[PDB]
């Protein structure tokens, strides 16, 4: 006795940052081979209401000498979903609901270098933010100490700001004071410090990934699935998708 709400999360980042590991971690909260192709993974989860969660795994980039050929297949997948949705909106014969395969949210994995963002990730996120909602994440946050994590977060924040990378929740979309407070609590977490679960409590040789004090994956999951879910979709539709509609 519930209804199905669709939600699409895409993981993006360099090779071996724990993208696939986080996906199975995220689904198992309700050797992984090398990701060579873009794969969508869908499972129905009942958080009172049923949600049709789809997670899109992507092959890592930054591994070659030229990475423009790596930033292209992901941009095509995003726009193709924007294309598949638009071909059904113009479809005047269609009596049925449109299935939403559009990427609503996109996690971006940042390597724990402990320094400023590299030109690659900067240019990549600037492209992605222009066509989709990005949520930057500190890949393998267990790599860093407590002190280093604080310093790294402070630095990543400065880059997004200095490079004009608008991440969710974009400040230009805050309605009132109550909307801003909840959004501030989200932005203060960016970049989210996540940890993939090695075997099984979902732990990491030990580090409980579902613990809010050990890492921030528990917060990120609930915020994206429960708290910020509908707001992301609304911005994906009214802002990002309309930007695509006008271009074509
Ligand atoms: N220390 C640590 N290691 C992790 C974490 N998450 C994943 N790993 C390790 O990283 C390695 C790669 O995990 P993986 O899922 O392959 O990243 P990946 O991006 O899929 O590799 P690729 O798909 O981009 S080519 C695995 O050996 C996994 O155990 C994490 O949070 N902390
Ligand atoms: Mg992978």
UniProtKB/Swiss-Prot annotation:
Residue ranges of the TM segments = none
Region annotated G4 motif sits at 139-142
Location of the Septin-type G domain = 3-248
The ranges of region (G1 motif) come to: 13-20
Q: Where is this region: G3 motif?
A: 57-60
Q: Which residues bind GTP?
A: 13-20, 35, 60, 140-148, 196, 204
Where found?
Cytoplasm, Cytoskeleton
Q: In which tissues is it expressed?
A: Widely expressed. Isoforms are differentially expressed in testes, kidney, liver heart, spleen, brain, peripheral blood leukocytes, skeletal muscle and kidney. Specific isoforms appear to demonstrate tissue specificity. Isoform 5 is the most highly expressed in fetal tissue. Isoform 1 is detected in all tissues except the brain and thymus, while isoform 2, isoform 3, and isoform 4 are detected at low levels in approximately half of the fetal tissues.
As annotated, the protein's associated disorder is:
A chromosomal aberration involving SEPTIN9/MSF is found in therapy-related acute myeloid leukemia (t-AML). Translocation t(11;17)(q23;q25) with KMT2A/MLL1.
Q: Which family does it belong to?
A: Belongs to the TRAFAC class TrmE-Era-EngA-EngB-Septin-like GTPase superfamily. Septin GTPase family.
Q: Which function does this protein serve? A: Filament-forming cytoskeletal GTPase. May play a role in cytokinesis (Potential). May play a role in the internalization of 2 intracellular microbial pathogens, Listeria monocytogenes and Shigella flexneri.
Quaternary structure?
Septins polymerize into heterooligomeric protein complexes that form filaments, and associate with cellular membranes, actin filaments, and microtubules. GTPase activity is required for filament formation. Interacts with SEPTIN2, SEPTIN6, SEPTIN7, SEPTIN11 and SEPTIN14. Interacts with RTKN and ARHGEF18.
Q: Specify the protein name.
A: Septin-9
Species name: Homo sapiens
> What's the encoding gene here?
SEPTIN9
Full protein: residues contained: 293 to 564 of 586
């Amino acid at each position: 006795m519930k209804q199905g709400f669709e939600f699409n999360i895409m993981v993006v980042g360099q090779s071996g940052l724990g993208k696939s590991t986080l996906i199975n971690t995220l689904f198992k909260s309700k050797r992984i081979p090398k990701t060579i192709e873009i794969k969508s993974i869908t499972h129905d989860i009942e958080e009172g209401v049923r949600m049709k969660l789809t997670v899109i795994d992507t092959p890592g980039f930054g591994d070659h000498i030229n990475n423009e050929n790596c930033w292209q297949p992901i941009m095509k997948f995003i726009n193709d979903q924007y294309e598949k949705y638009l071909q059904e909106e113009v479809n005047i014969n269609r009596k049925k609901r449109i299935p939403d395969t559009r990427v609503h949210c996109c996690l971006y994995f940042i390597p724990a270098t402990g320094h400023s963002l590299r030109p690659l990730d900067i240019e990549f996120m600037k492209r992605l933010s222009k066509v989709v909602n990005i949520v930057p994440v500190i890949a393998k946050a267990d790599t860093l100490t407590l002190e280093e994590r604080v310093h790294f977060k402070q630095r990543i924040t400065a880059d997004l700001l200095s490079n004009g990378i608008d991440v969710y929740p974009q400040k230009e979309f805050d309605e009132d004071s109550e909307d801003r407070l909840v959004n501030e609590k989200f932005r203060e977490m960016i970049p989210f410090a996540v940890v993939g679960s090695d075997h099984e409590i979902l732990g990491r040789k030990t580090i409980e990934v579902e613990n809010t004090t050990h890492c921030e994956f528990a917060y990120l999951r609930d915020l994206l699935i429960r708290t910020h879910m509908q707001n992301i979709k609304d911005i994906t539709s009214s802002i990002h998708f309309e930007a695509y509609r006008v271009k074509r």
